[PDB]
Amino acid sequence: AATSPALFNRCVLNWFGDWSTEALYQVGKEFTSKMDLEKPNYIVPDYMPVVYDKLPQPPSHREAIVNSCVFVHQTLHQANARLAKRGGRTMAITPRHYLDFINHYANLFHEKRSELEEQQ
Amino acid sequence: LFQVAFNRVARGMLHQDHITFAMLLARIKLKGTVGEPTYDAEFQHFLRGNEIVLSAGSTPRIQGLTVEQAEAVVRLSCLPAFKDLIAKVQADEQFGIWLDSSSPEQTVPYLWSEETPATPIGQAIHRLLLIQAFRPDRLLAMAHMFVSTNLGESFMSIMEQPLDLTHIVGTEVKPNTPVLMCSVPGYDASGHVEDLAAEQNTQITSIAIGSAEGFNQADKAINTAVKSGRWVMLKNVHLAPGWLMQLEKKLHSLQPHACFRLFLTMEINPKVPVNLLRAGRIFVFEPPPGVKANMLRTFSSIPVSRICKSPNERARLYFLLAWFHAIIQERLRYAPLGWSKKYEFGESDLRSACDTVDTWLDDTAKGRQNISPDKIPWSALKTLMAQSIYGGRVDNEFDQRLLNTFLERLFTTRSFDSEFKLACKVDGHKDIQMPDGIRREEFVQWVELLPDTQTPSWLGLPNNAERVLLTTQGVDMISKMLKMQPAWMRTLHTTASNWLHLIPQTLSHLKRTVENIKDPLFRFFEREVKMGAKLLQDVRQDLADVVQVCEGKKKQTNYLRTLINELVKGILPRSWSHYTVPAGMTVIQWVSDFSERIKQLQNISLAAASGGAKELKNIHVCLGGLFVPEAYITATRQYVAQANSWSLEELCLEVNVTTSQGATLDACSFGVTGLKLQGATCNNNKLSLSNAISTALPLTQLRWVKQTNTEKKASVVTLPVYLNFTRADLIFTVDFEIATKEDPRSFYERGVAVLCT
Amino acid sequence: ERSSFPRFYFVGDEDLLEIIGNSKNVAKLQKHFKKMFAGVSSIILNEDNSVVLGISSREGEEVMFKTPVSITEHPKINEWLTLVEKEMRVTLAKLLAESVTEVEIFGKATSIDPNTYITWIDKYQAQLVVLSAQIAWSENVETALSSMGGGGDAAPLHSVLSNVEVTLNVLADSVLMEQPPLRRRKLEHLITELVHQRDVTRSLIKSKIDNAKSFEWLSQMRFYFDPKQTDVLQQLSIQMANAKFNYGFEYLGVQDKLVQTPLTDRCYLTMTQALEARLGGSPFGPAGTGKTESVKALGHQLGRFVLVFNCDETFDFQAMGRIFVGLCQVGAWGCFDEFNRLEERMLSAVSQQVQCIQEALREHSITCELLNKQVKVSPDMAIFITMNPNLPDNLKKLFRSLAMTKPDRQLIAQVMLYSQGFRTAEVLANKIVPFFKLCDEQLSSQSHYDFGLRALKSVLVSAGNVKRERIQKIKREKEERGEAVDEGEIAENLPEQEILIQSVCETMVPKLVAEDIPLLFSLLSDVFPGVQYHRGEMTALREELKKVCQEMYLTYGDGEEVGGMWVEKVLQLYQITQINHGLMMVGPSGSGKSMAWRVLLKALERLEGVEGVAHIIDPKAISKDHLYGTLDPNTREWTDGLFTHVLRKIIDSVRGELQKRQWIVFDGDVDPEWVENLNSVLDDNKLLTLPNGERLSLPPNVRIMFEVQDLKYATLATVSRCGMVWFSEDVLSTDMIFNNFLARLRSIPLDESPMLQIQRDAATIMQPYFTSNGLVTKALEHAFQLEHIMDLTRLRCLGSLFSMLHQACRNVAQYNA
Amino acid sequence: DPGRKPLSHRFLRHVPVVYVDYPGPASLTQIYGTFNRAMLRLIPSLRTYAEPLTAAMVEFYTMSQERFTQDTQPHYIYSPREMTRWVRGIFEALRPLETLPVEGLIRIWAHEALRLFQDRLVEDEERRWTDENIDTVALKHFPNIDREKAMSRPILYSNWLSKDYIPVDQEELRDYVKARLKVFYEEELDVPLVLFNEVLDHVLRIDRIFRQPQGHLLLIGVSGAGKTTLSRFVAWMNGLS
Ligand SMILES: Nc1ncnc2c1ncn2[C@@H]1O[C@H](COP(=O)(O)OP(=O)(O)OP(=O)(O)O)[C@@H](O)[C@H]1O
Ligand SMILES: Nc1ncnc2c1ncn2[C@@H]1O[C@H](COP(=O)(O)OP(=O)(O)O)[C@@H](O)[C@H]1O
Ligand SMILES: Nc1ncnc2c1ncn2[C@@H]1O[C@H](COP(=O)(O)OP(=O)(O)O)[C@@H](O)[C@H]1O
């Protein structure tokens, strides 16, 4: 703003920010659709650690894993904020990190299944 | 692990830092021991004892103890194991013989009271605290004993032996890793490694680093030696930092022959890149202390042929020159006392002095086998070695006077007599006797025959100077150990709050008035109160902003950010320091000094407000507290000149030191307090040499009198008045009368001076 | 080419190209001589411009060759240049021989005739007469010591001291009466040298030295001239201590003599010892202690020319490299000033090159590799490096050090007072030096304050000038009533403290703020008790000021009356114009500086009859290259800059402007970028040096001033080198502004008369509101208490108010129409 | 202000300075009531609502400028330029609407307020504050209107499906942009993008600004959130290279 006034004089700005919990949940569901985490043995816990706002009242296994992924991303953000508060050096945690996490999940699940389900 | 770690790492340390690392090792092993208590509180006090704030009434003034000893006793008495220290000191009778004993640390009495018997390490740490409190000079020797108690008696025994190049180079060093031989200025380590190579029948290539052609020879030599396996040498590589960085990156990607050895001899300066220091083994070389060692080094450096020339007295002159150079160089270690600053009395000035001696001896004695001692151009050598050589670096007037004193005492026709005293009362009645020989060999035998008990009295300084150096090194080791061991904002808030409580609240400006304006003392004091009030308001506002940030209600701006950084690191903010301050002073000491100065300025302000200029003249003021003291002396001179209708230049300053109670406030007299005289004692305005570190002057009267236009008596000595113990500010010069049988030259040599604080 | 006769190798590739392509037109070669010769600014030829008749200094002193050099016989540039240099050296040697013989005739005499002495002084150069006096005194002392070699004998050295005393007396008599400026400088230098010789002879007498080989005599700089020596260069050998230097005999020209204080004597001894041991010396110390000029005077005294570099942040290699290796080839000394200011890489490069040349010089105790070239290094080389606190690590073992902690300002003042002809000079010095110490310490710190040794020198020179002016005034008075004229009688009955006080107040009071004036008065009362002064207020100039203010509608006041402060400031500006050529009108914007000089110019025009026109130049708005002049990189064409153009116009005397008074005022901010070129003009040399080498002499009637609002960022050299007047805001109170507004409205019509009557009526109606402590003044005082989006300036509000009242008058005019 | 340097006192002496501050609430009401009266002539049946509408825009603008001060964020500046942009956008939206009830006017007004004073916010709490306060202002100045239709939470305006810039439902917009994204995959770089409602809002805003001449953006957000991807998508879809 100080160096260049035109960037704030007439140019409009849009605050993308970061993907919300809803966005992360949608990414997790859409990306992790090929993998089959449909587990009938799943039982609904008395306490469910909800982090997605519109989570269906009965959590399915796929809903549970996507919710856990969003929770993991939120805990990374919280830990990064805590290190920032403590004064230690910090590195931003981008949604690209979440995409890479989903891709690595897909890869690990695919390889472990491809071997040990062949053994199945 | 412990022994090899200390032996390897200390090889790359200055000798003054070996004890710090040994103490760190002892602390690590103490923590490692499971049965031994942590001693966290004991070490906490041993490192941070000086930070405890005391009061005048907090010192009961125990007989037989100095004031500093008194605060040291009372501050350490806070420990639960040392609560009964006062009564035991009062009751004990052997305490007197122990306090002034030569080595009190060897037989420290059992004072601390405990419920259960102490471990030997606990006894050692208790005695260490006792030594630090009572005799801080012996702190180094007691730390050595403590480490020996922890890590074995012979832990440091390896350091005293000369460093064995053969084993450290043959094995335990990688050919890729360069050997860094870092020496302090005035020492070359090439001889050791050259003798190593000669004894190990290895052809070594030595190339100096002075120009791009030197870079070329270095590159070709290393490229040959990497494959051939010979040893290669680079000298004075501190001249080229960027090229040294390039050499480091070259050595990073290189696999040499098993016998390849890259030696880097260099001077210890910060310009050396960090990467080489991290990627190479470092060895530190220092010149051994001792006048004997310096004389031996000087004699070895000079070729034997030059000393033995046609005039047989040239050897005598060279010996006198070598002794003088040893005396000057050794006084450097005692920097606050021996001189005013760390001059660079290197080898080059010694070479120039030898050249001057040769030229003048050849000119005076034109190819004569013998020459009469009186015919020697003594005046020529004295003046040349006072002004051109050894004096060009001398900036202070009093240092140049000291150099004149040394040259007059040493370089004289009376030196050539067998009864000449090269030094006086080095230890009681005994004094150094100059050799009667006429050739170099007898002088070499004499210097190799010195008792090696080189007390500071050899240099002419008082024998307590070595104790002062030991105390300074002890405080240095304390500081280094302290540096070796979010909550930071909380403790910063705590210290800011305490300082805000300590510092006075405001300062009141003086009331301007025309007759006060005419008075010069009022002008000086109103300038002083203006400066003090402005700086006090700035400091108070800065502390208030710091506290405001501490609760988080204020954001840390760039000015606030740098101030917070300085406070956390303990370095004084540049904004706070507007008056001259000793360089080594820490923030807490600066705050205490500022508080005392504001207290004095409040006193002077209320005194001026109660009366006026007439009462302002008759005030006793400490010059150390005043921001600009020479302004105060000038103001007193102006006041007396205006009062007596005399011109300013025709006035001279006289000093009458008396007790505060038994003093007369004449029309031309101004009271001065806080002056401390070091190196002597003054009674009835007569100086007397003493071994005391400093004698506080009760009350100094500054009297301005008309110029008598009479030469000062031979018993009149001029003493500098420094602002602080650093001796960086020359405020003015006083004139005192010495007692009978006293030598003003001895006063000059012992560094007697008056200190504002 | 340049290898042979390396004396012209100082100049660059540019000047080499011009001197090669333009060898025939010798009239255009003066620039190269000005670059490379010391004082010689021009070469004297005949009408045919084919034979070298003589050389001329920048001041005007000329030296004619005994055997002129003919350029036609030696068409080659280097050959005839070498002949010119050799002829100059040999002719200076012949002049030195004649002058030393003449002064030896003057020597060993009970009394001397002033007329013959002045004739001898005029015959030879200042450098030549100083050297002749030094050899005469040295030979006298050597003879006296040779007679004293017996020991325990009557001392004729007392007679030598008495001879020095009597010639010093005739010098002190010769300076009171008016003398030409060149002869005045000669007398000043000669008095300085004779004072030093008298002091050292007194020291020798007190020491009772009886041997010529005694070191107390050897430590003094002794001069040995050998007429029998066949080589003119080796005829004069300078000896001090164990070191030897052959006098170079280069024409250093009439320069500023440097007095040899004991600090300077120690510097001489240290540098001489360093040179004998074949290594340079480093006179480190704080700035303003004479570190550079000690080296310069040592070079001047040995007949060597020194190159004083400026080691600023913006420093060059190629010009530095060529000039420095030119020193290496020539053998002339080169001095570095503020060697620490150089950047680290700059530092390392210069340290490496000087290390190589120094080790080569020690090897000579011969060529060295320089700029990928072999350079013949003469034995007579010296390289001196001044620093402000350390020496680079590669040079610590190659150079001797020396501390310039403090000059002996007391002796400095004493010797300069006695040079100006002041009696009781010791008392005046012992008063003035502590007085400036008090001024430096006790007075309030200001950016524009400068109370250094240069201030002492300028003040004392001005004191000498005003004392001479008072002597002339008393002489004219004595010729108008009575006839018995005796300069000694006027000197005796003339007081001296009052003149020094008046000079101090004339040179310094204009630079003080309003608060510091009583402080300065108290300092005068403390140092000079019971003695006071009255400024000679220019009553005729006061009448001219009141008339010019009436016609320019400005007010006029006297003393405490409305406008008195501004009138006094104008008078001080006139005084500083009289006693200086470079002015510094400093003060907050709105202090009235513009008409503070405009009204003064108009008053001087209407009083003295000398019409004046001012050239108001803005330096920051224009480009510096266009300000001073541009030199094309390729076509090498020189186009005069604006300041250069106006100087060329003023010198050309096209329309009689030399008779005219002219004021080139540099209104606008000043920064140490353009004024560095002007650092050649504010000095008493008074000339502008252009990059092409052409220099323009500053005409006496040209006065240059810089209407700068603040001097926070200007260098101290510019501050010290020009007179400066402070214009505090309190000089202009709002009442003057109101009165000027009312007069401007009343007399001049607004359109360019009915509406003039309108303006008069309106001004009459609002007269009660614009009086002192009126409605407007109170509104302004309350308004200043408020806050504003921009910085609040009084004249901003006043100008807006006046413009809006003018709009009201226009509205009245339109309504009436 | 940052990036602004104080001027020379010598220069200021000759130059008077007048402080042209922000227009007062009464001045804003007058000027934008004139604009709104000129605005609503296109729809005569809706002309009578100009006076309360202008008052509502002024009231919301006043509290937005008192709330999001420059201290909180460097880009939190409010000026009559913003409300002029509001007026221009509302006129552009009402131009194609030959007929419209008051509910549509309220919807467009809320849409433009969200696109102007709600995007620059950084904190979710600030955005929720803006939504609550726009609801309060709309109900305060238009009491005789239904909340569900006039201020339906999915305020999505697009000209992609319909010819005009009339409000669009989020689901139909999502389907259309999904088809366009499939075309984007088959033609341009094939990177899978999921379509959450934030993408819908962002792409609508980006296309809106690109459609407007001299459309210049300052995309601010954590790297990898999709700023460049969405910019490329909009540029390709609008034909911009
Ligand atoms: N003697 C006087 N009588 C009346 N008015 C005066 C007098 N002297 C100055 N002024 C007024 O004061 C102002 C001085 O203007 P001037 O341009 O000289 O200011 P300055 O101090 O040189 O400022 P700057 O640095 O901006 O040039 C003018 O408005 C002028 O009319
Ligand atoms: N010995 C001296 N005699 C006369 N004037 C001196 C002497 N020393 C210094 N000065 C004056 O003081 C100033 C010193 O300037 P300079 O030599 O540049 O100081 P430095 O060398 O410390 O930077 C000059 O104006 C000079 O006229
Ligand atoms: N709506 C979305 N759904 C899924 N992935 C997305 C979405 N938007 C962006 N991405 C991912 O972001 C990546 C590109 O990031 P990019 O837009 O270049 O970062 P930035 O926004 O910092 O410029 C793509 O690989 C893409 O997978």
Q: Which helix (H) or strand (E) holds B755?
A: strand B753-755
Structure tokens at B437: 């020989």
d(CA C58, CA C56): 7
Q: Which of C533, C682, C549, C708 is nearest to C617 (CA)?
A: C708
Within 8 A of C791 by CB-CB distance, chain D residues are 6-7, 9, 12
Contact in structure between B614 and B526 (CB atoms under 8 Å):
no
Question: What single-letter amino acid sits at B499?
Answer: W
Distance from CA of A113 to the nearest CA of D (A): 24
Query: Please, which residues have CB within 8 angstroms of residue B97's CB and are 6 or more apart in sequence?
Result: none
CB neighbour list of residue C58: distance below 8 Å, 6 or more residues apart = C34, C39, C41, C253, C685, C687
> For residue D226, how far is its CA from the centre of ligand 3 (angstroms)?
4
Comparing C-alpha atoms, which of B356, B452, B578, B195 is closest to residue C241?
Answer: B356
Q: What distance in Å separates the CA atoms of residue B719 and residue B753, rounded to the nearest whole number?
A: 5
Instruction: Say which experimental method was used.
Output: cryo-EM
Residue B389 identity: I
Burial class (CB in 10 A: 0-12, 13-18, 19+), C654: exposed
Q: Is the torsion defined by CA of D104, D105, D108, D110 positive or negative? A: negative
Q: Which ligand is nearest to the CA of C798?
A: 1
Backbone φ and ψ of B288, nearest 5°: -60, 140
Query: Ligand 2: residues whose CB is within 6 Å?
Result: C 258-259, 261, 264, 287-293, 386, 404, 407, 412, 453-454, 457
Question: What residue's CA is closest to ligand 3, atom 5?
Answer: D193
Strand, coil or helix: C332: coil
Whether residues C796 and D12 touch (CB distance < 8 A) is answered with yes
Listed by number, the residues of chain C in 462-481 with a beta carbon closer than 8 Å to a beta carbon of chain B are none
DSSP secondary structure string, chain D?
-TT--PPPHHHHHH-------PPPHHHHHHHHHHHHHHHGGGSGGGGGGHHHHHHHHHHHHHHHHHHS-TTT-TT----HHHHHHHHHHHHHHHTT-SS--HHHHHHHHHHHHHHHHTSS--SHHHHHHHHHHHHHHHHHH--SS-HHHHT-S---B-SSSSSS--B--HHHHHHHHHHHHHHHHHHS--------HHHHHHHHHHHHHHHSTT--EEEEE-TTSSHHHHHHHHHHHTT--
Residue in D closest to C802 by C-alpha: D16
Residue D20 CA: distances (Å) to CA of B231, C119, C573, C797, D23: 80, 80, 43, 17, 8
Chain D hits for A66, CB-CB cut-off 8 Å, are none
Q: Is C439 on the interface with B (CB under 8 A)?
A: no
D and B touch with 3+ CB pairs <8 Å, answer no
Sign of the CA dihedral with C65 first, then C71, C77, and C80 last: negative
Count helices and strands in chain B by DSSP H and E runs: 31, 16
User: d(Cα C251, Cα C259) in Å, to the nearest integer?
Assistant: 20
Contact yes or no for D19 and C789 at CB 8 A: yes
User: What strand order describes the sheet that includes C62-70?
Assistant: C40-45, C51-57, C62-70
3-state SS assignment for residue B40: helix
CA C616 – CA C593 distance, rounded (Å): 13
Q: In b/e form, how buried is each residue of C600-619, taking b as 16+ CB within 10 angstroms?
A: bbbbbbbbeeebbebbebeb
- Degrees (nearest 5) of the Cα angle B589, B594, B598? 150
Phi, psi (degrees; rounded to nearest 5) at C55? -125, 150
Q: Is C245 helix (H, G, I), strand (E, B) or coil?
A: strand
Q: Is C70 annotated as a binding residue?
A: no
Distances (CA, A) of C698 to B671, C183, C618, C645, C716: 58, 21, 20, 13, 23
Q: How far is CA C247 from CA B373, C5, C278, C427, in A?
A: 36, 19, 17, 38
Residue C708 is given by DSSP the state B
- Per-residue HEC secondary structure of C352-403 comes to HHHHHHHHHHHHHCCEEEECCEEEECCCCCCEEECCCCCCCCCCCCCCEEEE
- Please, do chains C and D touch (3+ CB pairs < 8 Å)? yes
* Structure-block tokens of residue D84: 């002029």
* Helix C564-579 vs helix C539-551: crossing angle, to nearest 10: 120
Has C591 been labeled as part of a binding site?
A: yes
DSSP string over B679-721: SEEEETTEEEE-S-S-EE-SEEEEEEEE----PPPTTEEEEEE
Helices (H), B411-519: 440-448, 465-483, 487-502, 514-518
Q: Which residues contact B537 (CB under 8 A, 6 or more apart)?
A: B506, B507
For residue B518, the chain C residues in CB contact (below 8 A) are 522
Taking the Cβ of residue B374 and every Cβ of chain C, the question of whether any pair is shorter than 8 Å is answered with: no
Q: What are phi and psi of B79, to 5 degrees?
A: -65, 140
Determine whether the interchain pair A20/D198 forms a contact, defined as Cβ–Cβ distance below 8 Å: yes
CB B608 within 8 A of CB B510: yes
End-to-end CA distance of chain B: 48
> Quick one: which of C198, C336, C329 has its CA closest to C280?
C336
Smallest Cβ–Cβ distance between D221 and the set A17, A31, A97 belongs to A17
User: What distances in angstroms separate CA B699 from CA B607, B675, C701, one per listed residue?
Assistant: 19, 8, 63
- C709 and D10 within 8 Å at the Cβ level: the answer is yes
Token pair 């007697």 is found at B752
Q: In terms of CA atoms, which chain B residue is nearest residue C406?
A: B395
Strand pairing of B699-706 and B651-658?
antiparallel
Enumerate chain D positions whose Cβ falls within 8 A of a Cβ in A: 2-3, 74-75, 77, 119-122, 192, 194-198, 202, 205-206, 209, 214, 216-227
Instruction: Please count the residue pairs, one from chain A and one from chain D, whose beta carbons lie less than 8 angstroms apart.
Output: 93
Which of D6, D16, D19 is the closest to C791 by Cβ? D6
- Helices B120-134 & B67-76, crossing angle to 10 degrees? 150
- Cα separation, C645 vs C688, whole angstroms: 12
Rg over CA atoms, chain B: 30
CB C688 within 8 A of CB C647: yes
Residues near ligand 1 (Cβ within 6 A): C 554-555, 563, 566, 589-595, 707, 709, 732, 736-737, 739-740, 795; D 10, 13
CA D226-D232-D237 angle, to 5 degrees, is: 125
- Give the C-alpha separation, C598 to D32, whole Å: 55
Nearest CA to ligand 3 atom 20: D224
Closest Cα in chain B, distance from residue C674 (Å): 33
Name the β-bridge partners of B235. Answer: B208, B265
Whole-angstrom Cα distance, residue D218 to residue A13? Answer: 4
- Please choose, from the candidates C759, C593, C715, the residue with its C-alpha nearest in 3D space to the C-alpha of residue C665: C593
**Measured between CB atoms, which of D3, D209, D222 is closest to A12?**
D209
For C336, phi then psi, to 5°, come to -110, 135
Strands, E, within C512-660: which ranges? 582-583, 585-586, 612-616, 629-631, 638-640
Q: Do A20 and D122 count as a contact with CB atoms less than 8 A apart? A: no
What phi, psi does C723 have (nearest 5°)?
-65, 150
Question: Cα–Cα distance between C305 and A10 in angstroms, integer?
Answer: 66
Sign of CA dihedral B393, B395, B398, B400: positive
Amino acid making up residue C729: E
Listed resolution, Å: 3.7
> In what side-by-side order are the strands of the sheet with B699-706?
B621-622, B669-673, B699-706, B651-658
Touching check for C176 and chain B: CB below 8 Å? Answer: no
Instruction: Collect all residues with Cβ–Cβ distance below 8 Å to C674 and sequence separation of at least 6.
Output: C619, C624, C627, C628
Task: List the beta bridge partners of residue C225.
Answer: C236
Sheet holding C306-310, edge to edge: C306-310, C333-337, C383-385
B238/C434 Cβ within 8 A: no
- The amino acid at residue C439 is C
Closest CA to C176 of C502, C460, C469, C429: C469
CA distance linking residue C480 with residue B715, whole number of Å = 63
Residue C103, Ramachandran bin (φ over 0: left; ψ between -120 and 50: alpha; else beta): alpha
Number of neighbours of residue B549 by Cβ within 10 angstroms: 21
Contact D222 A14 (CB under 8 A): no
Nearest listed ligand to the Cα of residue D233:
3
Question: Given an 8 Å threshold on Cβ–Cβ distance, is A8 in contact with D77?
Answer: yes
Q: Which atom of ligand 3 lies at the shortest distance from residue D227's CA?
A: 21
Q: How close does chain A come to D136, measured CA to CA in Å?
A: 24
C-alpha D83/C-alpha C317 separation (Å) is: 61
Q: Which residues of D touch C589 (CB under 8 A)?
A: 9-10, 13
